[PDB]
Assembly symmetry: C3
């Protein structure tokens, strides 16, 4: 179990909402899993009115990509901060032990890179986020967070120890955004990242987000970009919130098996209508679709979902089952 | 188990805080339970200063009435929207599967009605709420929500599988309200429901309620309208919050057995001082009274309870037990 | 089990963050444990800018001291309100049964004292707080709350019934503060406690704290006042929040065994990154340190932690373990 003598394997990361290919239950022994992530500071358009955010990301997306390893594996991450960026960054893994999650050992200025290795000895979905001394909240609410999933070597289990399996995994990062308004009542547009700082911290301190979005913008997971599934498929929905609480719900469905605190050595809860993700954590739910159609996946503070942006769609193909739900009489005039 | 061949039975709904008569454990097989609810848009007075709310309700109350069925039963609901109302409505049951909880099949304009049937295959307390496309948060925060309780056919159980029984059930709906203030610092009064919309959404977006009430108004469950019980009785307290988190507490008592996520196939937690209801869900607690007197049942964000309104009373008759609590020395001058 | 015939023992209270000496598992039978607490109204400096709070405390600290007894013991408290104070006070124990937690029997005006006895028949960490009729939220957010810990007579256990033991216990009270600003944008300073009332309630009603602190001020548990431990030691972290939700996290560590609702008859959850304390409750976590260094213990709403004050430090001595975490390559220029 000395990591220097284990087999090493490189994994290619994919952009949310997909998750890189991985095995659930595995016969493989422990290994050193190597990943590389590059920081990108960039301006992004977050709604249909043209509102912009001076964003900071891991690998160009919000959230950063999901990393998947098995319990007892070592994670080896190379963190690159290109010279085209303006600020220093680092990474704190909530799945790791010591040195402020790894943040003390990964301080990289623009033009530098560093490599960290840590043992992933606890199963579950964990947040990772950037945390530079003196500017922690700003880097996190500007987009620097993602999930590390550490699967039990034997896969997921129910409370009686029966195996659970998913057909597809999706990863959703929910972001509370603090975009300042000018004297004319319109959102401000900044030429540089540094220029947004002073106005943004003043808004953060009100604790009232201007927008709350899934994966980087209002409507990111709707219409053409909806998540997809089929009746009969079991989906794993991973949900991270690195700063603020949220309460996910699947309209028309349920959480069949849910780990709301996200830690797989604890028994899941079943049949949840709405679950709770604590700010600074990632949770996970399993659901097996039984009806076709469009489902909305949202934060069930409905103002936060419909007014501020935290809602997405899942489009499901299959046959309608009238034994679970049936329209007996369609809307018609009240009988007189 | 084809619903078309099961026995059908009509149930008469009662107004909160009571719950219609029902059996806990039942020897009866599955059935189609028929209910009817009528929407009522009306102006209501929500405090002792004369503040009004342009409200929207199921069956004229906030919350709407609690529906009770057993796991494996079918719910058959007729939803009526009279021609005296101005808006279109529908219903989303979190206990149902498919078609956005039933909302896609129950879109009724003023002057129409529709009938839906769904299988209640998961036990627990669930929220039901209205959710018309494009105006979801407004209909919900204006009062359109209630609870569906699906009891296990064998009744409630503790974590070791021992039977739990309640003598009385009460249902409390907690509502975060967003009442606009005019230029003179007083709450606005609207002539019609439609006229309140524009000002109300602006307040909703601040995420700061003006009032937070139990069952429709400040002081609804106090004084003459307090809930009642006797020492030795076991009470079931159902608590729904369709939009915002809340944290119920019984001053002078406890949650003996609590399902805070409200789903009865999971083991309850015991001896809770304060529990948590996620916005968009209903939970349930059991308590057996051991001391007489007045108890306060409230949201333990104390500003939310005492300043904004989320507090009620339970008045309990019986004999005082000095073995559980005794005043050794009543307040008196410090001895010099 | 008649309390009048049990042995009586007086306990000397210590100031947070320490907890008075006590046994975990005990062979001792039930007893009457006597404690005395004196109220102190005083002005305190809560940050490094000179901001003051007109505070109200149990025994001169925020939070008040932690009381520790074993399940089946009786608590006997003498509450003293000196004639140098201006307001009436009382105490509500969430661990007690009846008379609004004891508040109805402990109403003491300045110059008076009272003595209450109650049976501590439920294990767990409970909040105690002051609750004078008509001014409940103000006394609580001004500092009047603390924790009562009722240990199982057999000590703490894991979900399989295996014994858990801690080497040291620390107690942290988190306070949301509502300090008013004047017309010049600076925080107001009041000559008396009574003069702060009117402005303070107006700020409370916005539900937006100006500051959120651990143990009475920004930086209370940092630098020279950091908590301390050694690699290999198991620490018990008690966290109370009598009014508002919070989500504790140990950067670089985990919650090995956590009772987030704080009630020890329920099984703990393991491997948590971040846990949740409901406003109006106290929870508890155990952690065994495996790496030396500075750890930050904070509310993982990072704005609340770094901007508003809710963060502390734990300084741990010992040897670094490169098998759990290793810097493979220190920050260096990207290779060209
Ligand atoms: Cu950064
Ligand atoms: Cu963190
Ligand atoms: Cu409606
Ligand atoms: Cu809903
Ligand atoms: Cu007081
Ligand atoms: Cu209390």
């Amino acid at each position: 179990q000395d990591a220097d003598k284990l087999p090493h394997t490189k994994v290619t990361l994919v952009a949310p909402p997909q998750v890189h290919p991985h095995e659930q239950a595995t016969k493989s022994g422990p290994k050193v899993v190597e990943f590389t992530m590059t920081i990108e500071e960039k301006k992004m358009v977050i709604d249909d009115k043209g509102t912009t955010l001076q964003a900071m990301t891991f690998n160009g997306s919000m959230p950063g990509p999901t990393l998947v390893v098995h319990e007892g594996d070592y994670v080896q991450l190379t963190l690159v901060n290109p010279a085209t960026n303006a600020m220093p960054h680092n990474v704190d893994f909530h799945g790791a032990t010591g040195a402020l999650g790894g943040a003390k050992l990964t301080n990289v200025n623009p033009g530098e890179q560093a490599t960290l290795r840590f043992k992933a000895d606890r199963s579950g979905t964990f947040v990772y986020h950037c945390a530079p001394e003196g500017m922690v909240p700003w880097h996190v609410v500007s987009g620097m967070s993602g999930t590390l999933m550490v699967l039990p070597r034997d896969g997921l289990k129910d409370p009686q120890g029966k195996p659970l399996h998913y057909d597809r995994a999706y990863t959703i990062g929910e972001f509370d955004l603090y975009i300042p308004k000018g004297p004319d009542g319109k959102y401000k547009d900044y030429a540089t990242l540094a220029e947004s700082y002073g106005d943004t911290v003043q808004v953060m301190r009100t604790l009232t987000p201007s927008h709350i979005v899934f994966n980087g913008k209002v409507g990111a997971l709707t219409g053409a970009n909806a998540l997809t599934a089929k009746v009969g498929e079991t989906v794993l929905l991973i949900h991270s919130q690195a700063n603020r609480d949220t309460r996910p719900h699947l309209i028309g469905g349920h959480g069949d098996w849910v780990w709301e605190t996200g830690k797989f050595a604890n028994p899941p809860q079943r049949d949840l209508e709405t679950w709770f993700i604590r700010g600074g954590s990632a949770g996970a739910a399993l659901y097996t679709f039984k009806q076709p159609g469009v489902y909305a996946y949202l934060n069930h503070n409905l103002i936060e979902a419909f007014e501020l942006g935290a809602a997405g769609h899942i489009k499901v193909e299959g046959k309608w089952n009238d034994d679970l739900m049936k329209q007996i009489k369609a809307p018609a005039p009240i009988p007189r």
